[PDB]
Amino acid sequence: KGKHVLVVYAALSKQAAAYRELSLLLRRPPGREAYPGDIFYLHSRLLERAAKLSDAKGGGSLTALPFVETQAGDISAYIPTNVISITDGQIFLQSDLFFSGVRPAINAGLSVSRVGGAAQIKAMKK
Amino acid sequence: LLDAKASEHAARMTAMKNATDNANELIRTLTLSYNRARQAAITQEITEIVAGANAL
Amino acid sequence: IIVIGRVGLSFFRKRNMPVILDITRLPDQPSFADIKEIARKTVGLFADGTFDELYMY
Numbered sequence: 001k002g003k004h005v006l007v008v009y010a011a012l013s014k015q016a017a018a019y020r021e022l023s024l025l026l027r028r029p030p031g032r033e034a035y036p037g038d039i040f041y042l043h044s045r046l047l048e049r050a051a052k053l054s055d056a057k058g059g060g061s062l063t064a065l066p067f068v069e070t071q072a073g074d075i076s077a078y079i080p081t082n083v084i085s086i087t088d089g090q091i092f093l094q095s096d097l098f099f100s101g102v103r104p105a106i107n108a109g110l111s112v113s114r115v116g117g118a119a120q121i122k123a124m125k126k
Numbered sequence: 127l128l129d130a131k132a133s134e135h136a137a138r139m140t141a142m143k144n145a146t147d148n149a150n151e152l153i154r155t156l157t158l159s160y161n162r163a164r165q166a167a168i169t170q171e172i173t174e175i176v177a178g179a180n181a182l
Numbered sequence: 183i184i185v186i187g188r189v190g191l192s193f194f195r196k197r198n199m200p201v202i203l204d205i206t207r208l209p210d211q212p213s214f215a216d217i218k219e220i221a222r223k224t225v226g227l228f229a230d231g232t233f234d235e236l237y238m239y
Binding site: 027029030031032034 | 182
């Protein structure tokens with residue numbers, strides 16, 4: 001309708017685990033890490049509806065900020081690789097930085113953004 | 127000067143000997159962990175394959 | 183202070199001490215001929231008209 005919407009997915013690993021539960025119950029053949037075949041399709045369907053509509057459609061928008069909970073800072077895990085294979089960019093938080101009192105425990109080193117520059121006011125950009 | 131130079135060479139002797147010994151000690155444990163990891167990976171892969179085959 | 187070897191000299195440099203004579207580069211097999219220049223400096227300056235006590239470490 002031309003409004004502006006923001007969406008925050010609090011966990012996604014929980015949803016992936018629930019889908020695996022349901023698939024194994026329905027006696028579907030499993031794959032990697034006992035996960036069903038189409039977990040990538042699940043998350044692509046999830047995260048591909050976030051788009052900036054053109055003016056011809058009404059100028060709406062829908063931004064999303066999914067979260068992922070990692071175990072002992074594992075980045076190469078199956079579900080994290082799957083999701084960061086879909087999103088435009090990742091922002092990292094670090095346990096040692098959080099424990100040192102640094103909130104937010106931002107990590108500028110690994111965190112990337114694919115639309116940097118175009119998403120800032122001119123003053124901050126300069 | 128000559129005493130200092132001889133003592134420097136002796137210090138380098140001892141330091142490098144200790145370095146090599148520590149390197150070998152690290153190597154043995156690294157190889158052990160590598161073997162355990164390889165065995166775990168292959169056994170888990172085989173279990174996954176056989177379970178996927180039996181599921182049908 | 184008089185130091186040979188800047189690698190160890192840097193400690194007293196950070197300890198803001200004055201360096202009088204410094205020797206950094208020399209062969210691994212130095213000779214009396216090689217040390218003769220530094221010895222000549224050590225008897226020219228540091229001489230008894232300028233300096234009376236030393237402690238070598």
